[PDB]
Write an enzyme that holds these catalytic residues in place. Structure first.
Site, PDB file in Angstrom:
ATOM      1  N   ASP A 132       0.823  -1.193   0.000  1.00 49.67           N
ATOM      2  CA  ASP A 132       0.000   0.000   0.000  1.00 49.67           C
ATOM      3  C   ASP A 132       0.861   1.248   0.000  1.00 49.67           C
ATOM      4  OD1 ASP A 132      -2.560   1.217  -0.058  1.00 49.67           O
ATOM      5  OD2 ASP A 132      -2.476   1.579   2.115  1.00 49.67           O
ATOM      6  N   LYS A 134       1.165   3.953  -1.317  1.00 48.80           N
ATOM      7  CA  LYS A 134       0.766   5.202  -1.939  1.00 48.80           C
ATOM      8  C   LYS A 134       1.555   6.371  -1.371  1.00 48.80           C
ATOM      9  CE  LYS A 134      -3.784   4.575   0.141  1.00 48.80           C
ATOM     10  NZ  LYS A 134      -3.743   5.719   1.084  1.00 48.80           N
ATOM     11  N   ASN A 137       1.234   7.951   2.118  1.00 47.55           N
ATOM     12  CA  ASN A 137       1.769   7.211   3.266  1.00 47.55           C
ATOM     13  C   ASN A 137       3.264   7.455   3.445  1.00 47.55           C
ATOM     14  OD1 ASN A 137      -0.857   6.186   3.446  1.00 47.55           O
ATOM     15  ND2 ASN A 137      -0.325   4.122   2.708  1.00 47.55           N
ATOM     16  N   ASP A 154       2.653   4.315   7.152  1.00 48.53           N
ATOM     17  CA  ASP A 154       1.545   3.436   7.507  1.00 48.53           C
ATOM     18  C   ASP A 154       1.796   2.021   7.046  1.00 48.53           C
ATOM     19  OD1 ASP A 154      -1.424   3.251   8.558  1.00 48.53           O
ATOM     20  OD2 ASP A 154      -1.356   2.114   6.672  1.00 48.53           O
ATOM     21  N   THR A 174      14.603 -20.233   2.445  1.00 47.59           N
ATOM     22  CA  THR A 174      13.502 -20.801   1.678  1.00 47.59           C
ATOM     23  C   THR A 174      13.384 -22.318   1.852  1.00 47.59           C
ATOM     24  OG1 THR A 174      14.988 -20.858  -0.246  1.00 47.59           O
ATOM     25  CG2 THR A 174      13.473 -18.996  -0.068  1.00 47.59           C
TER      26      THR A 174
HETATM   27  C1  LIG Z   1      -1.708   8.080  10.623  1.00 48.82           C
HETATM   28  C2  LIG Z   1      -0.751   9.259  10.790  1.00 48.82           C
HETATM   29  C3  LIG Z   1       0.446   9.065  11.494  1.00 48.82           C
HETATM   30  C4  LIG Z   1       0.771   7.756  12.152  1.00 48.82           C
HETATM   31  C5  LIG Z   1       1.245   6.624  11.471  1.00 48.82           C
HETATM   32  C6  LIG Z   1       1.482   5.400  12.105  1.00 48.82           C
HETATM   33  C7  LIG Z   1       1.249   5.233  13.465  1.00 48.82           C
HETATM   34  C8  LIG Z   1       1.482   3.956  14.212  1.00 48.82           C
HETATM   35  C9  LIG Z   1       0.766   6.341  14.158  1.00 48.82           C
HETATM   36  C10 LIG Z   1       0.526   7.558  13.521  1.00 48.82           C
HETATM   37  C11 LIG Z   1       1.153  10.335  11.520  1.00 48.82           C
HETATM   38  C12 LIG Z   1       2.352  10.945  12.011  1.00 48.82           C
HETATM   39  N1  LIG Z   1       3.287  10.253  12.738  1.00 48.82           N
HETATM   40  N2  LIG Z   1       2.692  12.275  11.776  1.00 48.82           N
HETATM   41  C13 LIG Z   1       1.814  12.997  11.029  1.00 48.82           C
HETATM   42  N3  LIG Z   1       0.652  12.581  10.494  1.00 48.82           N
HETATM   43  C14 LIG Z   1       0.347  11.246  10.760  1.00 48.82           C
HETATM   44  N4  LIG Z   1      -0.823  10.607  10.294  1.00 48.82           N
HETATM   45  C15 LIG Z   1      -1.773  11.410   9.449  1.00 48.82           C
HETATM   46  C16 LIG Z   1      -1.476  11.610   7.926  1.00 48.82           C
HETATM   47  C17 LIG Z   1      -2.736  12.241   7.253  1.00 48.82           C
HETATM   48  O1  LIG Z   1      -3.867  11.416   7.325  1.00 48.82           O
HETATM   49  C18 LIG Z   1      -2.301   8.090   9.168  1.00 48.82           C
HETATM   50  C19 LIG Z   1      -1.227   7.753   8.254  1.00 48.82           C
HETATM   51  N5  LIG Z   1      -0.335   7.510   7.573  1.00 48.82           N
HETATM   52  C20 LIG Z   1      -3.449   7.094   8.844  1.00 48.82           C
HETATM   53  O2  LIG Z   1      -3.293   6.198   8.020  1.00 48.82           O
HETATM   54  O3  LIG Z   1      -4.634   7.244   9.503  1.00 48.82           O
HETATM   55  C21 LIG Z   1      -5.784   6.400   9.310  1.00 48.82           C
HETATM   56  C22 LIG Z   1      -5.410   4.921   9.388  1.00 48.82           C
HETATM   57  C23 LIG Z   1      -6.371   6.624   7.901  1.00 48.82           C
HETATM   58  C24 LIG Z   1      -6.853   6.750  10.343  1.00 48.82           C
END
Ligand SMILES: *[C@H](c1c(-c2ccc(C)cc2)c2c(N)ncnc2n1CCCO)[C@@H](C#N)C(=O)OC(C)(C)C
Ligand code: NA
Length: 307
Positions: A132, A134, A137, A154, A174
């Site tokens: 994933d 994208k 992320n 993510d 393997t």
């Molecule tokens: C989450 C997210 C994070 C983040 C990623 C992973 C973990 C374990 C905790 C938090 C994060 C951080 N560290 N800094 C700034 N923004 C952040 N986001 C928001 C990005 C904009 O949506 C998201 C991601 N990547 C995420 O996937 O949230 C959902 C799963 C869609 C609710």
């Protein structure tokens, strides 16, 4: 699993909850403040009755030490929700920041792809596939714009290769054991991670995505383009781009997953290796970052309808 944190104490005890920064059906990201130090963090809160976060958290625990992987800072489990605390990313989405840079260059693009592909070569070698990748992320931790501040963020779909037994495997060992067509599936997923990086690269160079024009493109038409194997590497924005870079793009987006480059081979490409011969002057790109965000969301919504 020692990931059984239900026994300790409270997240809300040690942190101040602030605003949402991202939302999904079975999880939410909020910003937060460590009460004792006043320092900022992100915290993904995950609904336990909707999804099992164990694989994401383990992957973050084992590999979050990588300089270009999001770094886990704490984690709680009040029973119903897992609270995963990380470093807060202050540079926003990578691709978006890059598209809003009028004078972005090929040399910059190669350093970005290097940093990112180095990271995924490591994940793959440890038997992890992201599934994933994208551009939304992949974030910058600060505003320095250094490659060093890139973070893949993510791992909610990431998968660690395992034997039937439930034991962890690297593509190197393997021998076992739990290897039924699962072989090909992991092999295909790593190839999709590379494809996603091809898409990232395409868009960095020219300022538009290869298979979608805006958020309005139907998923069917995006899939027809994707499956056509054909895309433009000529004219307009492509004129000003080296032939070495276009070559690498063709091989990362190769429709055939079995002919698609690996992370290992991507890093052996002259566009990555001879960075010092890449032009530092402007690229000629479309300037429509918001349109691109739409087309990107469209491209992955069309791919992820099932998954
Ligand atoms: C989450 C997210 C994070 C983040 C990623 C992973 C973990 C374990 C905790 C938090 C994060 C951080 N560290 N800094 C700034 N923004 C952040 N986001 C928001 C990005 C904009 O949506 C998201 C991601 N990547 C995420 O996937 O949230 C959902 C799963 C869609 C609710
Ligand atoms: Na890290």
């Amino acid at each position: 699993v020692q990931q059984l944190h239900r026994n300790s104490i409270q997240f809300t005890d040690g942190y101040e909850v602030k605003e949402d920064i991202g939302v999904g059906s079975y999880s939410v990201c909020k910003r937060c403040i460590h009460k004792a130090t006043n320092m900022e963090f992100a915290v993904k809160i995950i609904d336990k009755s909707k999804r099992d976060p164990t694989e994401e958290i383990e992957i973050l625990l084992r590999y979050g030490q990588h300089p270009n992987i999001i770094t886990l800072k704490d984690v709680y489990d009040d029973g119903k929700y897992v609270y995963v605390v990380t470093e807060l990313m202050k540079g926003g989405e990578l691709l978006d920041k890059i598209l809003r840079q009028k004078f972005f260059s090929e040399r910059e693009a190669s350093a970005v792809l290097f940093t990112i592909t180095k990271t995924v070569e490591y994940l793959h070698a440890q038997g992890v596939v992201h599934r994933d990748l994208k551009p939304s992320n992949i974030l910058y931790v600060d505003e320095s714009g250094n490659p060093e501040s890139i973070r893949i963020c993510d791992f909610g779909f990431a998968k660690q290769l395992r034997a039937e037994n439930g034991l962890l495997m690297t593509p190197c060992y393997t021998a076992n054991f739990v290897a039924p067509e699962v072989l090909e599936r992991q092999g295909y997923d790593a190839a999709c991670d590379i494809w996603s990086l091809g898409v990232l690269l395409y868009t960095m160079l020219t300022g538009y995505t290869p298979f979608a024009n805006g958020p309005d493109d139907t998923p069917e038409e995006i899939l027809a383009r994707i499956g056509s194997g054909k895309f433009s590497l000529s004219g307009g924005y492509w004129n000003s781009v080296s032939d070495t870079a276009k070559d690498l793009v063709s091989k990362m987006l190769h429709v055939d997953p079995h002919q698609r480059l690996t992370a290992a081979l991507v890093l052996r490409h002259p566009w990555i290796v001879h960075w010092d011969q890449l032009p530092q002057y402007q690229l000629n790109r479309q300037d429509a970052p918001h349109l691109v965000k739409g087309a990107m969301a469209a491209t992955y919504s069309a791919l992820n309808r099932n998954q």
